[PDB]
Design a protein around this ligand. Structure first.
Ligand SMILES: Nc1ncnc2c1ncn2[C@@H]1O[C@H](COP(=O)(O)OP(=O)(O)OP(=O)(O)O)[C@@H](O)[C@H]1O
Ligand SMILES: [Mg+2]
Length: 159
């Protein structure tokens, strides 16, 4: 409908914001952890975070992860067309198959990918590498094209 196109516009704006914010943060080596809900699992984890219920924008994400406010200390949960919360808890994965150069950010992303079907994006504070988790799998140091391809497939309803 005009509902469908509208949702499609919102979803592309979402993808765009994540990509741009993560690109900027990758350059500046700003650690980031952004989980995008695709079900009703993230509800418990949203409540552990600081409530924002704000509109999705690249500037907001980037500012969230600046290491000088309590907002950076955790994950950003995106739900519907909103940044539901910042500084949320994500469960660490107990996988020994995870690389050892990777730390608690990636491990948190992995865990949430294991117990939900949400897409999670990580920006390494150390390497500036961008990674992604879904279904208990981690795609490491993904390229912009690769990132865009996945986000498009997983977060934009084709219709
Ligand atoms: N369970 C968790 N839930 C949410 N955020 C977490 C969790 N564990 C760690 N973090 C975030 O990760 C940050 C430090 O990450 P750490 O260096 O331990 O892992 P890392 O993968 O090496 O991160 P980076 O690759 O960006 O250096 C902390 O400031 C914290 O905000
Ligand atoms: Mg570390």
């Amino acid at each position: 409908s005009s509902y469908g196109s509208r949702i499609e516009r919102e979803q592309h704006h979402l993808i765009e914001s994540i990509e741009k914010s993560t690109q900027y943060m990758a350059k500046r080596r700003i650690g980031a952890l952004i989980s995008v809900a695709r079900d009703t699992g993230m509800d418990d984890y949203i409540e552990t975070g600081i409530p924002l219920n704000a509109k999705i924008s690249s500037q907001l994400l980037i500012n969230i992860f600046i290491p000088n406010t309590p907002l950076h200390d955790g994950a950003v949960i995106i739900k519907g067309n909103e940044i539901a919360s910042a500084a949320s808890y994500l469960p660490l994965s107990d996988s020994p198959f995870l690389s050892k150069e990777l730390g608690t950010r990636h491990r948190a992303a992995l865990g949430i990918s294991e117990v939900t079907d949400s897409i999670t994006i990580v920006v390494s504070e150390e390497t500036g590498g961008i990674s992604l988790t879904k279904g208990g799998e981690l795609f490491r140091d993904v390229s912009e094209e690769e990132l865009h391809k996945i986000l498009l497939k997983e977060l934009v309803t084709v219709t």
